[PDB]
Amino acid sequence: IDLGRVIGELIDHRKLIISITSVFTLFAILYAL
Amino acid sequence: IDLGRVIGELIDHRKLIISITSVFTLFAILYALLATPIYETDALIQIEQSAPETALLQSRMILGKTIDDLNLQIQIEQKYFPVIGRGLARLMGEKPGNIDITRLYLPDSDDISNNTPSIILTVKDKENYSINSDGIQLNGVVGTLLNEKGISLLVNEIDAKPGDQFVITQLPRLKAISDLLKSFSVADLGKDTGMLTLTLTGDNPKRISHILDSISQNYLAQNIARQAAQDAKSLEFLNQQLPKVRAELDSAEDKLNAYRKLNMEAKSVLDQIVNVDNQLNELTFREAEVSQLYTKEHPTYKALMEKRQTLQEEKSKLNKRVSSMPSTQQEVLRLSRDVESGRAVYLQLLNRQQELNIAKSSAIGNVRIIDNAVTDPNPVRPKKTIIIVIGVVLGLIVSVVLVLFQVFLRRGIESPEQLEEIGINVYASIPISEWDTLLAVGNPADLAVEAIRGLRTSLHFAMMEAKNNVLMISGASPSAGMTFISSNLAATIAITGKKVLFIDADLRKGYAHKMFGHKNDKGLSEFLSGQAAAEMIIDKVEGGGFDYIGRGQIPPNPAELLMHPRFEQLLNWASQNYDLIIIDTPPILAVTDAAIIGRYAGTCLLVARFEKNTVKEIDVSMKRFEQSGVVVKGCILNGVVKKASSYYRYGHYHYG
Amino acid sequence: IDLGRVIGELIDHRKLIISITSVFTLFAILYALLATPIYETDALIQIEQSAPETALLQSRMILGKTIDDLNLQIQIEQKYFPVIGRGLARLMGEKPGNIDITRLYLPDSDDISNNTPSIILTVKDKENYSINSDGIQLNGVVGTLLNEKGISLLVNEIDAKPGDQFVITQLPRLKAISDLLKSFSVADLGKDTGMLTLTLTGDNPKRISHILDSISQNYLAQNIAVRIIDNAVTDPNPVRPKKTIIIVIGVVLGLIVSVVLVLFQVFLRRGIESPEQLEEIGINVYASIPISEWDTLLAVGNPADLAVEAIRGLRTSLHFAMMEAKNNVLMISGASPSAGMTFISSNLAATIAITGKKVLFIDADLRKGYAHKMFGHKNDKGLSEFLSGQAAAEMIIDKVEGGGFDYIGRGQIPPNPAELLMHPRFEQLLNWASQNYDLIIIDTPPILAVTDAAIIGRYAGTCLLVARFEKNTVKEIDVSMKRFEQSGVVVKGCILNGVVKKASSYYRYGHYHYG
Numbered sequence A: 001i002d003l004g005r006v007i008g009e010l011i012d013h014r015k016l017i018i019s020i021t022s023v024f025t026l027f028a029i030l031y032a033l
Numbered sequence B: 001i002d003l004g005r006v007i008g009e010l011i012d013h014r015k016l017i018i019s020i021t022s023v024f025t026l027f028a029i030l031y032a033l034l035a036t037p038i039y040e041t042d043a044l045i046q047i048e049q050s051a052p053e054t055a056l057l058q059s060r061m062i063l064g065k066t067i068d069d070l071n072l073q074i075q076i077e078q079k080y081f082p083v084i085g086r087g088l089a090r091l092m093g094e095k096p097g098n099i100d101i102t103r104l105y106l107p108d109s110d111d112i113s114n115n116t117p118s119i120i121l122t123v124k125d126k127e128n129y130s131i132n133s134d135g136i137q138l139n140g141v142v143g144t145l146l147n148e149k150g151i152s153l154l155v156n157e158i159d160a161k162p163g164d165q166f167v168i169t170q171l172p173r174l175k176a177i178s179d180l181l182k183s184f185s186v187a188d189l190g191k192d193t194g195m196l197t198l199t200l201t202g203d204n205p206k207r208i209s210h211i212l213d214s215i216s217q218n219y220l221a222q223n224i225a226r227q228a229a230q231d232a233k234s235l236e237f238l239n240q241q242l243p244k245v246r247a248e249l250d251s252a253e254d255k256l257n258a259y260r261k262l263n264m265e266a267k268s269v270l271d272q273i274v275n276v277d278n279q280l281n282e283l284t285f286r287e288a289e290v291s292q293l294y295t296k297e298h299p300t301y302k303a304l305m306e307k308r309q310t311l312q313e314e315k316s317k318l319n320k321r322v323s324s325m326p327s328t329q330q331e332v333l334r335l336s337r338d339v340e341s342g343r344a345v346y347l348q349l350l351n352r353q354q355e356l357n358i359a360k361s362s363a364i365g366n367v368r369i370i371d372n373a374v375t376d377p378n379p380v381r382p383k384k385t386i387i388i389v390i391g392v393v394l395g396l397i398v399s400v401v402l403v404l405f406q407v408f409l410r411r412g413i414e415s416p417e418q419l420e421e422i423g424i425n426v427y428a429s430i431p432i433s434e435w436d437t438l439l440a441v442g443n444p445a446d447l448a449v450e451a452i453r454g455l456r457t458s459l460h461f462a463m464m465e466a467k468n469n470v471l472m473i474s475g476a477s478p479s480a481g482m483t484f485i486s487s488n489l490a491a492t493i494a495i496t497g498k499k500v501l502f503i504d505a506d507l508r509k510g511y512a513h514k515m516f517g518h519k520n521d522k523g524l525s526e527f528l529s530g531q532a533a534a535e536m537i538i539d540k541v542e543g544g545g546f547d548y549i550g551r552g553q554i555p556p557n558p559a560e561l562l563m564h565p566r567f568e569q570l571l572n573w574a575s576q577n578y579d580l581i582i583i584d585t586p587p588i589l590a591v592t593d594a595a596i597i598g599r600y601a602g603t604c605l606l607v608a609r610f611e612k613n614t615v616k617e618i619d620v621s622m623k624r625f626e627q628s629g630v631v632v633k634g635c636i637l638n639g640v641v642k643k644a645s646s647y648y649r650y651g652h653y654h655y656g
Numbered sequence C: 001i002d003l004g005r006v007i008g009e010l011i012d013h014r015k016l017i018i019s020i021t022s023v024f025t026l027f028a029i030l031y032a033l034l035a036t037p038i039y040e041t042d043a044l045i046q047i048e049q050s051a052p053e054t055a056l057l058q059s060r061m062i063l064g065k066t067i068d069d070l071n072l073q074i075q076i077e078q079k080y081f082p083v084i085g086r087g088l089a090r091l092m093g094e095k096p097g098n099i100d101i102t103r104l105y106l107p108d109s110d111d112i113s114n115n116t117p118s119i120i121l122t123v124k125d126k127e128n129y130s131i132n133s134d135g136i137q138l139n140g141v142v143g144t145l146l147n148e149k150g151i152s153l154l155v156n157e158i159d160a161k162p163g164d165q166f167v168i169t170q171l172p173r174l175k176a177i178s179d180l181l182k183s184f185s186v187a188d189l190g191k192d193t194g195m196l197t198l199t200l201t202g203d204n205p206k207r208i209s210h211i212l213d214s215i216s217q218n219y220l221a222q223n224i225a226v227r228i229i230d231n232a233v234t235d236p237n238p239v240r241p242k243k244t245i246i247i248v249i250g251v252v253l254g255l256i257v258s259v260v261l262v263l264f265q266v267f268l269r270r271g272i273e274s275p276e277q278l279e280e281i282g283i284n285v286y287a288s289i290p291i292s293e294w295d296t297l298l299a300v301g302n303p304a305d306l307a308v309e310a311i312r313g314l315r316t317s318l319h320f321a322m323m324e325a326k327n328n329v330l331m332i333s334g335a336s337p338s339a340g341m342t343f344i345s346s347n348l349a350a351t352i353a354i355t356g357k358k359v360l361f362i363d364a365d366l367r368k369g370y371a372h373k374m375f376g377h378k379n380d381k382g383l384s385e386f387l388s389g390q391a392a393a394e395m396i397i398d399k400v401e402g403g404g405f406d407y408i409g410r411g412q413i414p415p416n417p418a419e420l421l422m423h424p425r426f427e428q429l430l431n432w433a434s435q436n437y438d439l440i441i442i443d444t445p446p447i448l449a450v451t452d453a454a455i456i457g458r459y460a461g462t463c464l465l466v467a468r469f470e471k472n473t474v475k476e477i478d479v480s481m482k483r484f485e486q487s488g489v490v491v492k493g494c495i496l497n498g499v500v501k502k503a504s505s506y507y508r509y510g511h512y513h514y515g
């Protein structure tokens, strides 16, 4: 395994990563407000 | 990896490194030059312990007393539109403005969040000014008080130039106490001695010294009160009035209860009266205690009379407002004024009762002030040098991280050994020519044309023992340089007196006719489809010396056209009338045209773009050609540039 | 790596090492000899405790009283223009001047920044003096007070030579207090006794003792409204700067930086250092020519030079290598320009000619050839004019005066050099010459730059590369060999040129005179 492979994996899975992080941040904002 | 590699990488990325370091250092400079300076003042007090005195100095009673004395709940700040206007004004040497305000009462909207009312005052001259809260514009004059629209304001000694604006906020008392407490510190410095060091930080070098002096005076006065409070009748005087004051308070409550069992202006004036009554009450009690411990001609003592004069005038005009109000609303206000003032004065008497009790138990001998507060003219914040150093070091560290990142993310070819490890002969390395014309004709002395001549002499030896005199140039990915290499190579081989035919077999995006000067009718397509003869398609390059065959009109079936036997008939015919035939083709990874053509070509070469293509793409292209029965002779690295990290030396320099 | 290598590297770079260390030591000595000396004065106080007392001594009341007593707000600075003039003046034995001023009042400009007004006084004699604030020149006399232009000033006992200048500053009271507080220290020395040691540092040995006495007296008087055991005295030996430690740090820093810089220069060299590096790859090195310290042929001007001896060695190597060659044509080329190809070729031709064989030297560097300059020339009808067809084979051959061999110069620089060399007339010329001469040596441009050498090498029986000693790398030579081989030219071997003596080499040449 190398850095290029993991970077490519993140780039490919960016849709899932962004969706999950956005959901968690949205719940955090709703609780905080 | 070794030191040479990293040094070369740094040298190559020097422009990026310098840019990043410079931008962070510029931001650090800008911050350390526009951040508002913070001065610090200190004082020294003698005590005859010192652990509870530290806590008693930071109590809300002492700080509240000093805020009421110095009137710190009136916040005045010069107006600058940007978050840097103040810094620019200071650097340009402009003298900051200041206004002395001794009386302020906003209408106290007091909504859910904005508990701090504020107005904007614009200086029109040395005497008059304009005031706006929410667009309600008013004209005021220094000296005379302004009491209009539920707003009371007294402005004295305007020191600014006309046109300046100042934000005036009336923040709550606890907010002022918290603000002062955040910046105030007490220490013993010896952990046993009777020495107290008081410290206060703030942006106004004189205001903070005045505040610290006021704190010291209040502490000294409070603690030495016991000297003459033992025989002072005020203690019993408090014990006498306090039950009595409660009596009318109960009566005031009951009468209001009886009448109860909402005019906007009435409560607006009602609160303002209540504030005026409060201001009078402690002022008299303040004026009382000042009278024994100070002199009448003392500036503090003389101050209270015009403050007392101010309050009475405000109340008098307030009484004028009430007299102009209906008695139905006036009746409620008189009950309310009695209730509010009585309740307010009751708490004050409870406060004064509690204050004098603490003086009774104060064990400290009395007080002594060794050093009155003075302010150090050299600001303590921001610390310029450390900020600058952190900025520079941060710039360097982020630059190094970014460059190392780009190094480990790089995959393109860098030097012909990468190709030669796999077993691919690299016949040339063409540099970038920074110079719709043939390079080998416009600028025959260019470096790239020299490298192409080197390729020519390599080919003249490689193409011996070839099946025929057909050379096919192809590549892995588009815009790698196949047309560039093919056309210029044809030019250089033609100038040596051999007859050359150039065929643009890129029936999809071929533009050789544009680059040669053309008769675009009857290209290769029109021949292959059968609607042209082998003689109508050959054209002469003007600045060249070789013939060409253009693609013609784009067909809908390029790959299937190239499979027609007319193509091989054309090649066999041309191979007897020319010394060399050079065929330009589309990439091999994209389409299959090159693999169809390569069956008829004696020699085939790939072109690899310098930094874009990778080793694997070239290997894959070689395999794809091989599976179709075409043997690739070798590769041509194109688009090389100078990299200090290479440690590979080309001859890409002028010699002449 | 081993110890022998690093010792050799140090011996080689000794000049740089010594220069750097010498510069650092010189700066250290100059700093330790020009920094103004700082003396320490001290006193001893007895307390009948002492924890609050250190805080009370350093209070603004005591220090303020002393400052008012001694007028320490009147700062007098003897004027030296450079940041070293005072140090030189002290070293030259010049006695520093001083002036007693007992009452001073400047108009107190008090702008945003310069809260410290200051003037300049120039001494005219023992009696009168000139004063200038901002060009306003006034004349004053010791004794009588001056009250003019918002500047009021009284001078007593000017003690200096005429022509001296002094800056007089009236700094604020708080600034003076802070300055005094910086130099003043109190310690307990027993942590339990009633003994306190008071210390004060300053540049004037007497003024600081007076100041400490004033502090002690003011303190003592204040307390009785505490006992002075030892009044203040000044140690005559300055405490700063500490000369020896400064010099030692300078020397050690110099050695450290020199060693580290040498380590970079060692780790960042890539050039060839010995023929062993080339022979690892599989390249025969036929000679190693040293640098000749001595527009003329070296093999003619100084036939006994070391470089010519090495070239004779190369000649005897060639006479054996060039047997079983397909013809008598030898081509010298190289990797990079200014490696020595023309030097080697011309001198080798000279040494082979002096043995009684007929030698022809062809300068086929049609781009930057200068052989005709170095031989004495009739520059008409070089090689270009022959190849282009406007000259015959016999008007281009010229005779070297001090040599003994013929040559063919390039002629006029053509616009198409590489295309000319492909003409068959070139091969005709070589075939004709190969029957009239014993040896033909062809000089060529580098191979990495242009392709002329690879065109010529097809007709050459033997080819040799020339590599400069320290400049070229092994990679360049290997690349040049491969590029020649791709074009169908077999390179016999290499010639290392421009060697110098390196102690770190541990590889021994015979570059020394024997005779």
Ligand SMILES: Nc1ncnc2c1ncn2[C@@H]1O[C@H](COP(=O)(O)OP(=O)(O)O)[C@@H](O)[C@H]1O
Residues within 6 Å of the ligand: B430, B431, B432, B433, B434, B448, B475, B477, B478, B479, B480, B481, B482, B483, B484, B485, B638, B639, B640
């Ligand atoms: N070494 C080079 N120096 C300067 N320009 C180049 C070089 N190689 C290619 N190019 C130019 O960049 C463009 C891409 O090359 P081109 O051959 O036309 O595309 P393709 O390889 O797909 O046929 C062209 O405009 C070409 O002239």
Ligand SMILES: Nc1ncnc2c1ncn2[C@@H]1O[C@H](COP(=O)(O)OP(=O)(O)O)[C@@H](O)[C@H]1O
Residues within 6 Å of the ligand: C289, C290, C291, C292, C293, C307, C334, C336, C337, C338, C339, C340, C341, C342, C343, C344, C497, C498, C499
């Ligand atoms: N061993 C050497 N000793 C002294 N000078 C040398 C030596 N080798 C080359 N030179 C001189 O350094 C210069 C470069 O050599 P030269 O052969 O003329 O360049 P090029 O290799 O490109 O033909 C010349 O002036 C040459 O006389």
Ligand SMILES: [Mg+2]
Residues within 6 Å of the ligand: B482, B483, B506, B584, B585, B586
């Ligand atoms: Mg193309």
Ligand SMILES: [Mg+2]
Residues within 6 Å of the ligand: C341, C342, C365, C368, C369, C444
């Ligand atoms: Mg030369």
